Design a protein around this ligand. Structure first.
Ligand SMILES: *[B]([O])([O])[C]([N]C(=O)[C]1[C][C][C]N1C(=O)[C]([C])[N]C(=O)OC([C])([C])[C])[C]([C])[C]
Length: 198
């Protein structure tokens, strides 16, 4: 499969999440995603085929994971934006007030701005701390997907937020959305990964 930020993948033939970013760990290919999407060794499938397994994750506390892929996967430095693509150029962290977009299998590519950093989400499973908050909308299924600036600086992966009864926060004003992402920097250093760029 071609690995691109934002696309759908399933875990153990049950849950759906979105790919965050293609990365490598020495000769191993992989992608970063949300830790709540799977447990270590869960099987990831893309378009019905097995592409790899969860190699490590932390959730709750943090919300991060990486999936190691088979050699036959093609890693690409890109995030989906409809039929088009945003090129991944690096991981400079943007500041509060910067504009950012996110991509995932449920609401597609949505943009907004970063409104706060170091937020704690109190999930049923336990608190997740240190998340960055943006106001781009999102929905169930977007978890694990990419958060990137138009300039190509990868920011983090979708963790969670205030979904409404219709499964997303797109029907409420940006001023009322809380869409939280796990910062990418700590995930790359915690697992020794390098981002694929173009
Ligand atoms: B994702 O799996 O596609 C999904 N994320 C998701 O449901 C996460 C994982 C644990 C719970 N959670 C939430 O967003 C919870 C539902 N939201 C929540 O607690 O909002 C607060 C504002 C109260 C933190 C998808 C990204 C929505």
């Amino acid at each position: 499969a071609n690995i691109v930020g934002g696309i759908e993948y399933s875990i153990n033939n049950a849950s759906l999440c979105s790919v965050g970013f293609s990365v490598t760990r020495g000769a191993t290919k992989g992608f970063v995603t949300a830790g709540h999407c799977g447990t270590v060794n869960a099987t990831a499938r893309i378009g019905g085929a097995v592409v790899g397994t969860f190699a490590a994750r932390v959730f709750p506390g943090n919300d991060r994971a990486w999936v190691s892929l088979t050699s036959a996967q093609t890693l690409l430095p890109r995030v989906a934006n409809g039929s088009s693509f945003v090129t991944v150029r690096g991981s400079t962290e943007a500041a509060v007030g910067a504009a950012v977009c996110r991509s995932g299998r449920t609401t597609g590519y949505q943009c907004g701005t970063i409104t706060a950093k170091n937020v704690t989400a109190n999930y049923a499973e336990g608190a997740v701390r240190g998340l960055t908050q943006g106001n781009a909308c999102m929905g169930r299924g977007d978890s694990g997907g990419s958060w990137i600036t138009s300039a190509g600086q990868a920011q983090g992966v979708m963790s969670g937020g205030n979904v409404q009864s219709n499964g997303n926060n797109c029907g409420i004003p940006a001023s009322q959305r809380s869409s939280l992402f796990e910062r990418l920097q700590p995930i790359l250093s915690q697992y020794g990964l390098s981002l694929v760029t173009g």
